[PDB]
Amino acid sequence: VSLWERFCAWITSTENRLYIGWFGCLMFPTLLTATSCFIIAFIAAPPVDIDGIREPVAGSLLYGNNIISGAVVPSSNAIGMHFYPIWEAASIDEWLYNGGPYQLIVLHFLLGVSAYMGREWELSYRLGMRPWIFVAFSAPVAAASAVFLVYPIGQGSFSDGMPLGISGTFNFMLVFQAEHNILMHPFHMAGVAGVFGGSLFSAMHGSLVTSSLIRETTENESTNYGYKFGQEEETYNIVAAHGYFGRLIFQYASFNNSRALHFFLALWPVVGIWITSMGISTMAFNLNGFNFNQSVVDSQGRVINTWADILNRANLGIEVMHERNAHNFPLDLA
């Protein structure tokens, strides 16, 4: 009867086209502002002093870029970790010079993605679902907050944060290799196993369902039209695909349970990306990966090279060349 109850009834209605919910009250204003500023800053945005040395790095399309090289540049080294909104900038020209829109996009992104995650919970509550799709979405939220939030914190500047682009991503990955040795760190190892394993069990499960489909169509029409939507009959012989994989490797390595099978598809990647995103986090605070340089010696004591020493000389090439003007002192403490 009241105005608030007629507003709570609408905002929590599943009869809307897109469910809004109470998290959409701060998902939609956040992500539309992260979007509408991203499209403008990617297309039309002046160059940005990223190194704090007043050498402005172009990153937008109107200043001679493309899809690959164009990128929303991170904020300055001069700012660093300080909060830099528009009203604390004394003009928009001073805001866009010092890496303004990187903080406006990222902070409205991480609020909107952490609200998109809670929105996946909310609709599962109002639909009668068991709730935990949003726990599986915690794994890219852990990884998005690792390279945009946690790594600028432990390194003390948003300038070490990830550039919102495509070539800026590979500037981020290579400089992160030289300074932290991520490939030898066992948490990037535990998530390469998460996505190689994840793409394995995806294409391994998706093939054994498509292999054991039941005849419901003719050879002229499509294979997919043998599934009517909302039917109650099972659309594939699960005993058939169990007997196949029960002979392809051996018998006891096969899940006859389809529920425990469809749980292992959700376990393996998500645990692999939780562990990986806490690799960037523990390497944000300079707890680097393994270092086996000069580890094998002869009885005389001369250093015998290994593959890690060849990997070290690739890291030394990126270390002596990243931010080639920003350094003045012999050790990259930042």
């Binding site: 086209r17 399309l61 001679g64 493309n66």
Partner: peptide, 30 residues
Amino acid sequence: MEALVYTFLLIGTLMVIFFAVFFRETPRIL
């Protein structure tokens, strides 16, 4: 002149995302 093509590819991609969400073929039981 060159960046005009890149912008048209990007907003043209966001059009077919708009039509796929709202003008989708709504699936129906029976």
